[PDB]
Design a protein around this ligand. Structure first.
Ligand SMILES: O[C@@](Cc1ncc(CC2(C(F)(F)F)CC2)[nH]1)(c1ccc(-n2cccn2)cc1)C(F)(F)F
Lengths: 230, 232, 338, 128, 299, 54
């Protein structure tokens, strides 16, 4: 699995730029693609979504109308055309794959991301933005949502991501359930409106920013992010 | 509905579309079962149709329609079990050695067993009497007489409505027609008429062999349609 | 020499028969008469799986009762979501004549077999997303009749060669072989403890085999004709067999004899599949009369009939959690009952 | 336990008469069709005749038509194959066979490799 | 009273009985419910509805003085029955096309159990039959007429106003051309091709096979002859009533009614008209044997 | 060669099958009935259940 984004550079206000991303190492046709922006020194934010076969396409209200996402199965590539870029649109965009089925783990792989320099929805709130802790000590991060993510089907559509300094986000938890390749030290539990992420024993490489996300509604809202200092 | 459930339903619909698409290719191709003893020349018949694997698949197109011929010859002698898997098939191709009078009785017994099978009571059996040249040479040499194995052959007369091909010795024609009548009588035994036998005479050099299978399959499909449409 | 061997074999058979008859102090029926009747267990169809194109031949439940794998004679393995009916995966098979399928206890692997004699284990958790053939092991000299997973690394498969074999997925070679059957092996079932497994063959007999020791511990010969299906009792101490005589026979692995013979006059079609409920009371057996019947293991009477299908019920199974029952038939439709 | 028993045989003179008597237990003999097969030294199994459940349908092989007569008596679960005349060619072990199912017409007991529902066979040596 | 009325009642009874038993066996016999039989039960429904309403569009003219009570009855009976006729004709030609696709093109088969497409096309046929009759209904405008002999004003059913003779003429001409010419032609050509293919099949199938294949040859020839007889029983049956309406339409005789030997002609044309609706069930009865089996079983 | 081989193989199989422990059918039947009674509370279809949990 690999995702490489391109098309970045400097663009003046009101200009247009077509971003692209090449998929390899997996069945691109079977995985839906997501675009998540990250403003400098700020948390993540969902941009747009494209389902398999271009059947369902949704855009964020803040970018709805200006951005248009498209994919090509024969070439296994993804495109994102942006028009009338606003000064606020300056941020780094990450491409993410997703596949939806019983037992799946959407958002399991995040690309390298591309930088673009220019010139009601559920809200998520975390305990604190920074939590300094010494190595080997147990770490617990808390979160809260404005709406109960516990759907009638009993599934808790809560996601956690860890973005180490100089690396793309990594999926830790997608629903208690541990993602593949993630150490068992990570664990998650909480109610429909309150959530908690716990690390049994912090490692040296666990430093980074922890981002939460809800997936009960397509307008995915990301948290402010919690930093951990060694 | 949740987004994950909606995407799962979308993928399920995509899989349903793929299955419906493959259904066309499945129903368009006709599947055929090839049966016959080790002594039968079924191998030569298969090799000629150039138009520990327990199963051997052979796809050949004839008259813009594809035929899938499956042959099972790498399994145990008993077949009352895996024969059941080949129900609802287009036609069964049975090859018998008409020259070897010794194994002829075993071939007749196997054909009778296959015909009276409960699960195959609705599948037509295409019968190719292979090795006609060898049988002709044997009956011309006079060394091996069919009477030694089948006493009824001595009291059997050539059918009046027969159509001997040009250049066929009387003895050869009489012998082949006797074998044909024996097979037809064995098939008619307890036959409810739901399926019909298609006996044909095949050789080792005959090129017009796939046409017989094509015509038999077309007739079988036409009869099945007439049955489904409640016309017969 | 051969005469002495034949005489010794006859004496051993007579001694075994005498010892078996001696333990027949009382039949299960006499002991199961004081218990209250099970009553008419009426069942209704809850889900209809219209996805399969051709005859559905085999199906199995995974560790989770919500997942369902089913095989058809067209070369397609469809993973069904019993709750939402959504198709999870579609695996185009190489061999079109698949006759058996298995769902690993971990849910990550699924195996199948048929006339090709090859067993291709399909990994559902591939990192690439798409299902890939993990290990296409082979070596059998006959069609594969049944497949069952003992663990993520070991899988046992039955074949028409009259010998069962336990394979190592990692090594990809025969770990151990089981010989002794005279007829082609028709069905195989694993005990709940994974220690022993029982399989039936074309001959009118069934034998119990050990996973660790490559040898049979007991042998049963109470069948009158070809045994088609076999299933382990939920406790692992007994098993039932289906044969081409319209009579189910419950064999015990401790008394070494038949306990109850579920038979009826009007039922003449052969048994194609058999299964047990979590409690063991409801014994379900698929018949060739285009319907399935429920038999009370204790009372031995007919508890109900499932006549929703219009063709031979080829396969059936009860969920591990005890919430639903699935049934497959040659009519390409798979119905779930509850 | 299903088990078949056979009786009759031995040495016979050419053209003589002999009857083969077999029995079976452990199943409803009346429901299963019965067949006969012979095996001569070096030759495989050869079917000679069969008899339906009620005996209403009987057939014989061309090599033995007329000379042999098959009969069954469900009253005691016995099968009989009366041979009125014998030739040196028919010297072979006669094996009894049962139908694989009690309600079917097709038979597959001709398997030369092995069959689970056939008797042990009795030798019939016919010669001067 | 009159033997003609007794024969009419007997024909209606036998036809409605046949169609009712047909639909009953279609409902009850699960195995009978299959794609090709949807059009058959649709034709049965059409014939039942037609025989219902021709029952007394006849009673009004025979052994009666006029329509029962209301003018709306004219529109209802009219649209209703110019529709049943359309449904019958369209279902007959659709069955002919399906049998052609099945017999002449056996290799090109559609997915079975597709009840949706057949039912969708049957509904489309019904909708077209209702649309083509909406004109006949909207232009009823029942008028009153005074018989010159009886000299008594009485309301009489009329398809179009007396003044617009050309309109009624064009309506009758279009109805004839659409319901007798093109359907008859297409049915005849399809059934002729089917018969030719069946006759060629008798020579394609092995003939020397002893009393095994010859039976199928005889059955195929029999069904071909039955199809030709059905073509003839449609051509000859729907000819005289269409001729009588065309004559009545083009004559445009108003305020006067003829009385002569021609009276037998109109009743004969009526008898032949709905007799075809009575044939369709017994035709399939004669065609298939298992059909007769389940028909006598349900009856 | 092969005849006596399979003969002695079957002889050894019968010998090792004969030397197996056995118990009376009464105890096995009692154990089975006890298992059924204990697990009857979780049978899939012995007792009805609301559609909410189905
Ligand atoms: O001529 C048509 C059209 C037609 N003629 C007169 C009317 C008015 C009408 C009413 F006044 F009652 F509304 C009788 C229906 N429509 C036609 C003729 C006869 C029959 N038919 C009657 C009885 C059973 N079948 C149906 C159609 C044809 F189709 F022949 F062009």
């Amino acid at each position: 699995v690999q995702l490489v984004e391109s098309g970045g550079g400097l663009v003046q206000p009101g200009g247009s730029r077509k971003l692209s991303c090449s998929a390899s190492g997996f069945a691109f046709s079977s995985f839906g693609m997501h675009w998540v922006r990250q403003a400098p020194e700020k948390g993540l934010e969902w941009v747009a979504y494209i389902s398999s076969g271009s059947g369902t396409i949704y855009y964020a209200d803040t970018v709805k109308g200006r951005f248009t996402i498209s994919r090509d199965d024969p070439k296994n590539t993804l495109f994102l055309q942006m028009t009338s870029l606003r000064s606020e649109d300056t941020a780094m965009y990450y491409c993410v794959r997703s596949i939806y089925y019983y037992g799946s783990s959407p958002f399991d792989f995040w690309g390298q991301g591309t930088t673009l320099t220019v010139s009601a929805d559920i809200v998520m709130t975390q305990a604190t933005s920074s939590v300094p802790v010494t190595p080997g000590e147990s770490v617990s991060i808390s979160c809260r949502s404005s709406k109960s993510l516990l759907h009638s089907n009993g599934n808790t559509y809560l996601y956690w991501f860890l973005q180490r300094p100089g690396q793309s986000p990594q999926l830790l938890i997608y629903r208690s359930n541990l993602a593949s390749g993630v150490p068992d030290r990570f664990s998650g539990s909480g109610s429909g409106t309150a959530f908690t992420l716990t690390i049994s024993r912090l490692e040296a490489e666990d430093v980074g920013v922890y981002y939460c996300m809800q997936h009960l509604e397509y307008p995915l809202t990301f948290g402010a992010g919690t930093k951990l200092e060694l | 509905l949740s987004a994950e459930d909606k995407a799962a339903v979308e993928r399920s619909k995509m899989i349903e579309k793929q299955l419906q698409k493959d259904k066309q290719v499945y129903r368009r191709t006709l599947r055929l079962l090839l049966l016959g003893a080790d002594n039968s020349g079924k191998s030569t018949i298969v090799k000629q149709m150039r138009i520990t694997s327990g199963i051997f698949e052979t796809k050949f197109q004839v008259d813009k329609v594809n035929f899938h011929m499956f042959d099972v010859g790498a399994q145990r002698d008993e077949r009352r079990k895996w024969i059941q898997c080949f129900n609802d098939v287009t036609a069964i191709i049975f090859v018998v050695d008409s020259s070897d009078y010794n194994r002829l009785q075993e071939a007749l017994n196997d054909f009778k067993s296959i015909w009276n099978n409960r699960w195959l009571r609705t599948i037509s059996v295409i019968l190719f009497l292979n090795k006609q040249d060898l049988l002709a040479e044997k009956v011309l040499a006079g060394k091996s007489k069919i009477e030694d194995y089948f006493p009824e052959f001595a009291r059997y007369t050539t059918p009046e409505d027969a159509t001997p091909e040009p250049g066929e010795d009387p003895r050869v024609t009489r012998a082949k027609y006797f074998i044909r009548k024996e097979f037809v009588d064995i098939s008619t035994a307890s036959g409810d008429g739901r399926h019909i036998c298609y006996p044909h005479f095949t050789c080792s050099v005959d090129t017009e062999n796939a046409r017989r299978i094509f015509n038999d399959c077309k007739d079988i499909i036409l009869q099945m349609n007439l049955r489904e449409y409640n016309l017969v | 020499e051969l005469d002495q061997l034949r005489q010794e074999a006859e004496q051993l058979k007579n001694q075994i028969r005498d010892a078996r008859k001696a333990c027949a102090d009382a039949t299960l029926s006499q002991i199961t008469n004081n218990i209250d009747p099970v009553g008419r267990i009426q069942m209704r169809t809850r889900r209809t799986l219209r996805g399969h194109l051709a005859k559905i031949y085999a199906m199995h439940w995974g560790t989770d009762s919500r997942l369902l794998v089913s095989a058809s004679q067209d070369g397609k393995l469809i993973i069904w979501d019993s709750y939402t009916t959504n198709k999870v995966h579609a695996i185009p098979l190489r061999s079109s004549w698949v006759m058996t399928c298995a769902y690993a206890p971990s849910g990550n692997y699924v195996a199948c077999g048929g006339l090709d004699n090859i067993c291709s284990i399909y990994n559902l958790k591939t990192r690439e997303g798409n299902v890939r053939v993990s290990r296409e092991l082979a070596g059998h000299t006959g069609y594969l009749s049944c497949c069952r997973f003992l663990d993520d690394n070991q899988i046992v498969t039955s074949s028409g060669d009259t010998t069962c074999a336990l394979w190592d997925i990692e090594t990809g070679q025969q770990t151990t072989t089981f010989t002794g059957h005279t007829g082609d092996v028709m069905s195989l079932s694993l005990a709940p403890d994974t220690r022993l497994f029982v399989s039936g063959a074309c001959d009118a007999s069934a034998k119990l085999w050990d996973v660790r020791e490559g040898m049979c511990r007991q042998t049963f010969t109470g069948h009158e004709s070809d045994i088609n299906a076999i299933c382990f009792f939920p406790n692992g101490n007994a098993f039932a067999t289906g044969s081409d005589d319209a009579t189910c026979r419950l064999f015990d692995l401790r008394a070494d004899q038949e306990l109850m013979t579920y038979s009826h006059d009007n039922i003449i079609c052969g048994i194609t599949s058999v299964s047990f409920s979590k409690s063991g009371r409801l014994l379900l057996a698929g018949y060739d009369d285009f319907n399935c019947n429920v038999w009370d293991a204790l009372k031995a009477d007919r508890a109900g009939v499932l006549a929703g299908h219009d063709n031979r019920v080829s396969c059936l199974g009860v969920t591990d959690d005890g919430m639903a029952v699935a049934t497959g038939s040659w009519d390409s439709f798979l119905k779930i009952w509850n | 336990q299903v088990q078949l028993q056979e009786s009759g045989g031995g040495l016979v003179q050419p053209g003589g008469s002999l009857r083969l008597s077999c029995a079976a237990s452990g199943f409803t003999f009346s429901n299963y069709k019965m067949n006969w097969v012979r095996q001569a030294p070096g030759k495989g199994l050869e079917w000679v005749s069969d008899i339906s459940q009620s005996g209403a349908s009987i057939s014989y092989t061309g090599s033995v038509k007329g000379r042999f007569t098959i009969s069954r008596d469900n009253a005691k679960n016995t099968l009989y194959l009366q041979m009125n005349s014998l030739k040196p060619e028919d010297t072979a072990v006669y094996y009894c066979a049962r139908c694989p199912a009690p309600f079917t017409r097709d038979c597959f007991d001709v398997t030369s490799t092995t069959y689970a529902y056939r008797g042990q066979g009795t030798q019939v040596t016919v010669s001067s | 009273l009159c033997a003609i009325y007794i024969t009419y009642a007997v024909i209606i009874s036998v036809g409605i009985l046949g169609n009712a038993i047909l639909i009953k066996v279609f409902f009850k016999t699960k195995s009978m419910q299959t794609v090709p039989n949807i059009f058959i039960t649709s034709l049965a429904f059409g014939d039942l509805l037609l025989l219902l309403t021709c029952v007394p569009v006849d009673a009004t003219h025979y052994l009666a003085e006029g329509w029962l009570f209301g003018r709306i009855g004219c529109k209802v009976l009219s649209f209703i029955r110019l529709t049943s006729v359309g449904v019958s004709v369209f279902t007959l030609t659709i069955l002919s096309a399906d049998r052609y696709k099945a017999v002449v093109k056996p290799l090109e088969r559609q997915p079975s159990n597709a009840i949706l497409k057949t039912c969708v096309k049957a509904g489309c046929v019904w909708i077209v039959s209702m649309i083509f009759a909406l004109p006949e209904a909207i232009f009823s405008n029942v008028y009153t007429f005074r018989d010159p002999n009886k000299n008594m004003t009485f309301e009489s059913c009329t398809s179009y106003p007396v003044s617009k003779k050309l309109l009624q003429e064009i309506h009758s001409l279009l109805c004839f051309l659409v319901f007798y010419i093109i359907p008859l032609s297409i049915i005849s050509v399809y059934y002729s091709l089917i018969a030719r293919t069946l006759y060629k099949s008798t020579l394609n199938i092995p003939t020397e096979e002893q009393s095994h294949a010859r039976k199928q040859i005889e059955s195929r020839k029999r069904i071909a002859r039955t199809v030709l007889v059905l073509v003839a029983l449609f051509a000859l049956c729907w000819l005289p009533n269409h001729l009588l309406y065309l004559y009545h339409s083009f004559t445009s005789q108003t305020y006067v009614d003829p009385s002569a030997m021609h009276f037998i002609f109109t009743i004969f044309s009526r008898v032949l008209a709905f007799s075809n609706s009575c044939v369709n069930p017994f035709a399939l009865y004669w065609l298939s044997k298992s059909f007769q089996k389940h028909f006598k079983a349900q009856l | 060669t092969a005849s006596i081989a399979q003969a002695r193989k079957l002889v050894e199989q019968l010998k090792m099958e004969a030397n197996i422990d056995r118990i009376k059918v009464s105890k096995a039947a009692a154990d089975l009935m006890a298992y059924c009674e204990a697990h009857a509370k979780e049978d899939p279809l012995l007792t009805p259940v609301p559609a909410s949990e189905n």
